Amino acid sequence: MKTVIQDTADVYFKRKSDGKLVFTAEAQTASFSQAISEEKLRGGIGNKPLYILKSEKEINLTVKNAFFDLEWLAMTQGESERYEVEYRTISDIYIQFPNVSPSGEFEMSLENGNALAPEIKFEALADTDTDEMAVVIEASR
Amino acid sequence: YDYHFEVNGTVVRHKNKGFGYMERFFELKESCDERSKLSKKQYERFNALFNFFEKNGVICMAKDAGTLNTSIEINSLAYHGKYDVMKKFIEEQSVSIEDDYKKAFFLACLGRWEESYDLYSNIILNSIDESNGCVYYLSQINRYRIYQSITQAVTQFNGLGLLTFGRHYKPFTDEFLARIEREMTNFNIDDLFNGMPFEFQKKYKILEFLSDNQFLYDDTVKLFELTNKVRSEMSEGSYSFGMSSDIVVLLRLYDNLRFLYENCLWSVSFHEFHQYIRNSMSLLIEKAEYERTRDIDELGFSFFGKKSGFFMEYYDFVNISRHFKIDDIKNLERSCSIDKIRFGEQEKIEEYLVGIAEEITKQFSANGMNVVFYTQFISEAKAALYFAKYVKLSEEGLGKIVKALLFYFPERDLDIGKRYVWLERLTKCNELPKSIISIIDDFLVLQAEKHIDQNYSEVSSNGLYSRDYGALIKHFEKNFISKRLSEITLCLTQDKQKQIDFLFKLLPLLSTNAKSHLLSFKSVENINDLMNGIRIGLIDEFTPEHEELIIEYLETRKVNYIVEKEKGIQTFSSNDYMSTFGIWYFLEEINNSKMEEFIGMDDQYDFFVDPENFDYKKFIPSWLKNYNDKLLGKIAGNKHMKHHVIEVLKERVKNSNDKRYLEILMNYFI
Amino acid sequence: CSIDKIRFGEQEKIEEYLVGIAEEITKQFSANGMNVVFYTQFISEAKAALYFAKYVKLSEEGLGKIVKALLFYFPERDLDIGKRYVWLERLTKCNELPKSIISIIDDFLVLQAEKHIDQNYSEVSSNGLYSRDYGALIKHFEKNFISKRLSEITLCLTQDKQKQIDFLFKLLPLLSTNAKSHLLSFKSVENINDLMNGIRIGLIDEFTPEHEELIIEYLETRKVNYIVEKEKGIQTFSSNDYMSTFGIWYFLEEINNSKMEEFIGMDDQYDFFVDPENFDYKKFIPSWLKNYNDKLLGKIAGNKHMKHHVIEVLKERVKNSNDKRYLEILMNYFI
């Protein structure tokens, strides 16, 4: 007999200037892609005296089953911005992504919203001064 | 469409603009005190609904779910292969139509298609007063499917059957086929659901996909997207939490299998579903193999520790041995190696294999059974035995499997060449108990006795003969010289001329007492004695007599080459094992000074004869195409050979790389 | 797959389609704006077309029109400063840069310079690419580009323009000699970030003792913070790979100070180079091999002690996995 085990992760997306919880949802996937690019970035010998180690890093996250905060909804509906994300996956870890950007796209379903496309993507933004893309905290098992 | 009932068993609201009737159901399900306030009839209805939902796997709403331990159980004797229990139920009496509807499916599984068609025709008539449309609708669909199966099998048995079998057995009489052709004409299955009453079209809309082109129609398209997503997630290097894109595929496949088998729908035995199962199992196997060799991440190692939700079990074993042909498993093995992906619940797998062996043993008692059952069962029994090497069997269960494999198991499709491969694969996972070697000895004794009549030539699709069984016995156990097989060696006269050569090839387990008769009639040839005798032993080295015996061959093939060497033609001898002696020069198996004269006739002859002197710019990849162990070790002992072989392997890896050129490379050279 | 092997036909209607998309974007975003219900169902197609237009050969005028809309009028909500450069580089590399496009990248740079007048505006990328990448892309095709307007804006700074000073310093090679002197009088190498920008610009060829002292201070403070953090489970994952660069410098003997040996245990890639003989060996992430320069790969393969285990790691990653780069670095550079 087969038995399937399915874990879950809770994601909290909120604002920066305040602790205003924008919303909470589950976890679907995370892509950490660090690599380099074509030869146009570095051509000939160039900087022969010193090695420069180019590292293009991207941190994408996908989220489903997201409901928006009632108080935040009321505040924003009645009349640029930098946000943050916190994970609470299971031991259990505390993933914190500061300064994330919410991407997204509108999809129209023929069957009046079959699965209702509740997928939201975040991309980690790296500033010239800030460097902590993600902070991981370890707690009791 | 008010809710989504996801495959994991969680309900999520979709529109539900009115009062939520599903969440309020789970409220009463959780709180026992709130269930008391319901009326008596409503309380009984609540109990009946709770039983149905619990049996179907519905758990709770999406939000209040948490960790979910989803379980799968298929309660169908047809799925597990309990053929004897199916026959017992068929032969017994039917209490009602609900038992006949399952007896018809059991008959269809067993292969008695005509009886199942007649029983379905009866059920269509005896399902009028009972006034339940589900049985009538399913009986119509199943009868249509069985008629399609019969008309398809007729096209094969009256087609290639002249060479497929030879007897050209027609199990369907020419009058039954005409009757089903008359009755099943202008059926128009597509117009079967629309003709039913409007109440039926609304109560049982979910059954509309059966009698339609929709049968595994949307499922295939939805599986295509899931396969694309799963393949993309294995190349971008990304993780997945909760219900991954592959776990959805597994749960959806085991939903379809359960729905088809537990409802006795014959449509589970067609092409649109067979391809679906093949694709789902291939994707799941690939995804399981990928996890075992995942790349360690800077944060992903701690970010996602477990990362696993799959483990091959008895259900996977049966779905792989019943829906995968032998060829498909053959390509899959070389690409993905499941030897590290172990199978669990091996007690149930052992029971399944023992049942397959028991069936294959019984069916040669008469060997005149239903032909369709044989055609559908030999493929499944030819794959479970091919697949048992990945499962650790046990004593006295493996004995029966090796019994049935090396016994009354159809020779027309499991000839001795493939039989030896099956046996060696089975023994790979095991350690070859003593009883197994005794059974192999018995097979050898009966096979030796069989060819005593006139010839009994060992026709094998593969290039492996009966000698390979004894060779494997001695390679794994160099102590099998038992007296019983020698009781036919020298106790019989050495004038049969066919048993003589068979004991010649089975020589390594034969002693000098047997030799005095068996080797007496046999003599020494040019290389024929070497090709037969020393190929399996009894000399094992180029003895002083061989020092001159090879002299004849070295000049016979030398003049044979010279005839077309002084003019130039294709009359060179096809017996190219003269290269082997040249090859034997390289691996310390030829130390003759006259072999410097034969250099120049074969491009690879001086290649092997001259381990360093040979000009290695002349070296060619083709000399390594068919190759073995000690020569592999002999490049590793010659640095200059190795220097050119690594170069040619790299050039091939850049020019023509397909599968094997790195296969030769990585095992050595470093 | 390999779409580059796929060869496209009718590269005159595709060019017209892309030019029409660029015209639509320019018209809508040069005015007050686009309709919100129409912006939803058009921008996804425009982004896809401008990203997929790398395999199409466009003319000089069409390329200029497309670049002038991919840099100026494409909203920052969709295409940030990083993805914008990543999409412009595909168009630039596939052609020979007809010199009409370099003048547009220069205009984009001068627009960013004007934007940088305010103190609180900082570029937010997502790949690690900024305007300095645009400046290096411009130099990759034209070797001198003594900029006119960039030099003019550089010759206007004061002591209260530190953000403008930093931005102009990150684009040093595009400035003229007068602008170079005026800016270099206004700032000097004083920080790890400034030191990195100096090497990328091409100023510090040799590390003076002051640079070594600053690097040692950076390592010491990093060790102090690491010891502070280890009391808890917090382990920060940064985006600047300075520790790896220090190890790569030590391995190549670009520095001659042995005190880097003390700071072992702060990183795993760092200890792989500072103390390769005592590295843990299976704390080695194989993907590091995919980033190193070919000269770095050759020098790593030169060290036989490192080579002995790196060959096994690469063999394991090649036989089990399936990637062209891994086997390539295995067979050309390694054994």
DSSP string of B80-131, one letter each residue: HT-HHHHHHHHHS--SSHHHHHHHHHHHHHHT-HHHHHHHHHHHHHTTSTT-
Residue length of chain A: 141
Assign 3-class secondary structure to B220-264. HHHHHHHHHHHHHHCCCCEEECCCCHHHHHHHHHHHHHHHHHHCC
- Best residue of A32, A37, A38, A51 to probe chain C, by most C CBs closer than 10 Å: A51
Using CA atoms, how far apart are residues B638 and B205, in angstroms rounded to an integer?
75
Using CA atoms, how far apart are residues C59 and C126, in angstroms rounded to an integer?
30
Q: Report how far apart, in Å, the C-alpha atoms of B572 and of each of B575, B578, B583, B602, C24 are.
A: 9, 12, 19, 11, 76
Nearest Cα to Cα of residue A120 among A38, A56, A28: A28
Q: Which residues pair with A93 in a beta bridge?
A: A138
Other beta carbons within 10 Å of C213:
11
Amino acid at B557: R
- Contact flag C319-B670 (C-beta cutoff 8 Å): no
Experimental determination approach used = cryo-EM
> A27 to chain B: nearest residue by CA?
B241
Burial label, C235 (beta-carbon count in 10 A; 0-12, 13-18, 19+): middle
> C236 to chain B: nearest residue by CA?
B299
Pairing label, strands B10-13, B60-61: parallel
- Best residue of B234, B241, B319 to probe chain A, by most A CBs closer than 10 Å: B241
Does the beta carbon of B4 lie under 8 angstroms from any beta carbon of chain A? yes
Other beta carbons within 10 Å of B631:
17
Nearest Cα to Cα of residue B134 among B109, B97, B170: B97
Does the beta carbon of B295 lie under 8 angstroms from any beta carbon of chain C? yes
What are A50's two structure tokens? 């010193």
Q: Report how far apart, in Å, the C-alpha atoms of B17 and of each of A117, B13, B20, B349, C161 are.
A: 19, 9, 8, 50, 59
- Contact flag A43-C235 (C-beta cutoff 8 Å): no
Counting one residue from B and one from C, how many pairs have CB atoms under 8 Å apart? 24
Measured in angstroms, the resolution is 3.1
Does the beta carbon of C200 lie under 8 angstroms from any beta carbon of chain A? yes
Amino acid at B351: E
Provide, for chain A, the percentages of residues in helix, strand and coil under a 3-state DSSP scheme, each rounded to the nearest 5: 5, 45, 50
DSSP symbols for A10-77: -EEEEESSS--EEEEE---EEEEEEE---TTTS-SS-S-SS-----EEEEEEEEES-EE-HHHHHHHH
Counting one residue from A and one from C, how many pairs have CB atoms under 8 Å apart? 114
Using CA atoms, how far apart are residues C268 and B477, in angstroms rounded to an integer?
50
Nearest Cα to Cα of residue A96 among A105, A115, A83: A83
All chains having 3 or more CB pairs closer than 8 angstroms to chain C:
A, B
Residues in chain B with CB shorter than 8 Å from the CB of C320 are: 293
What are B208's two structure tokens? 């509309």
Contacts of A57 by beta carbon, 8 Å cutoff, 6+ apart? A32, A33, A34, A126, A133, C127, C128, C239
Nearest Cα to Cα of residue B606 among B591, B618, B592: B618
Contacts of B413 by beta carbon, 8 Å cutoff, 6+ apart? B378, B382
Other beta carbons within 10 Å of B634:
19
Point out the residue among A26, A32, A138 whose CB comes nearest to the CB of B297.
Answer: A32
Residue C5: DSSP 8-state: G
Q: To which residue do tokens 């190890």 refer?
A: C247
For chain A, the distance separating the N- and C-terminal CA atoms, rounded to the nearest angstrom, is: 29
Residues in chain C with CB shorter than 8 Å from the CB of A47 are: 199-200, 202
What are B157's two structure tokens? 């048995």
Using CA atoms, how far apart are residues B619 and B605, in angstroms rounded to an integer?
11
Nearest Cα to Cα of residue B8 among A5, A10, A66, A2: A5
Does the beta carbon of B15 lie under 8 angstroms from any beta carbon of chain A? yes
Residue B9: DSSP 8-state: S
Contacts of C75 by beta carbon, 8 Å cutoff, 6+ apart? C29, C43
Point out the residue among B72, B241, B247 whose CB comes nearest to the CB of A8.
Answer: B241
> B335 to chain C: nearest residue by CA?
C320
Point out the residue among C137, C206, C292 whose CB comes nearest to the CB of A49.
Answer: C206
Would you call B13 helix, strand, or coil by DSSP?
strand
- Contact flag A65-B297 (C-beta cutoff 8 Å): no
Give B 461-520 residues with CB within 8 A of chain C: none
CB of B15 within 8 A of CB of A125?
A: no
Does the beta carbon of B653 lie under 8 angstroms from any beta carbon of chain C? yes
- Contact flag C285-B299 (C-beta cutoff 8 Å): no
Residues in chain C with CB shorter than 8 Å from the CB of A46 are: 202
Residues in chain B with CB shorter than 8 Å from the CB of C287 are: 295
CB of A27 within 8 A of CB of A89?
A: yes
How many H-runs (helices) and E-runs (strands) does chain C carry?
A: 17, 1
Residues in chain B with CB shorter than 8 Å from the CB of C317 are: 295
Point out the residue among A1, A26, A29 whose CB comes nearest to the CB of B239.
Answer: A29
> B4 to chain A: nearest residue by CA?
A115
* A134 to chain C, closest Cα gap in Å: 6
Residues in chain B with CB shorter than 8 Å from the CB of A29 are: 233, 238-241
Would you call A99 helix, strand, or coil by DSSP?
strand
Using CA atoms, how far apart are residues B276 and B287, in angstroms rounded to an integer?
17
What are C107's two structure tokens? 């205009």
* B308 to chain A, closest Cα gap in Å: 9
- Contact flag A47-C126 (C-beta cutoff 8 Å): no
Using CA atoms, how far apart are residues C18 and C40, in angstroms rounded to an integer?
19
Residues in chain B with CB shorter than 8 Å from the CB of A113 are: 14
Residue length of chain B: 670
Angle between helix B133-157 and B113-125 (nearest 10) = 150
What are A51's two structure tokens? 């090695």
Count Cα neighbours of B641 within 13 Å in the Cβ-side half-sphere: 23
Q: Report how far apart, in Å, the C-alpha atoms of B55 and of each of A63, A81, B25, B584, C65 are.
A: 31, 50, 16, 69, 64
- Contact flag A2-B316 (C-beta cutoff 8 Å): yes
Buried b (16+ CB within 10 A) or exposed e, C216-230: eebbeebeeeeeeee
Point out the residue among B299, B666, B670 whose CB comes nearest to the CB of C319.
Answer: B666
Q: To which residue do tokens 């489970």 refer?
A: C233
* B19 to chain A, closest Cα gap in Å: 19
Give C 256-285 residues with CB within 8 A of chain B: 285
CB of C167 within 8 A of CB of C112?
A: yes
- Contact flag A124-C126 (C-beta cutoff 8 Å): yes
Buried b (16+ CB within 10 A) or exposed e, C174-197: bbbeebbebbeebeebeebebbbb
Point out the residue among B293, B298, B666 whose CB comes nearest to the CB of C321.
Answer: B293
Amino acid at A120: I
Residues in chain B with CB shorter than 8 Å from the CB of A5 are: 67-69, 309
- Contact flag C315-B666 (C-beta cutoff 8 Å): yes
Q: Report how far apart, in Å, the C-alpha atoms of B305 and of each of A90, A97, A141, B240 are.
A: 9, 19, 13, 12
Nearest Cα to Cα of residue C262 among C223, C228, C225, C226: C223
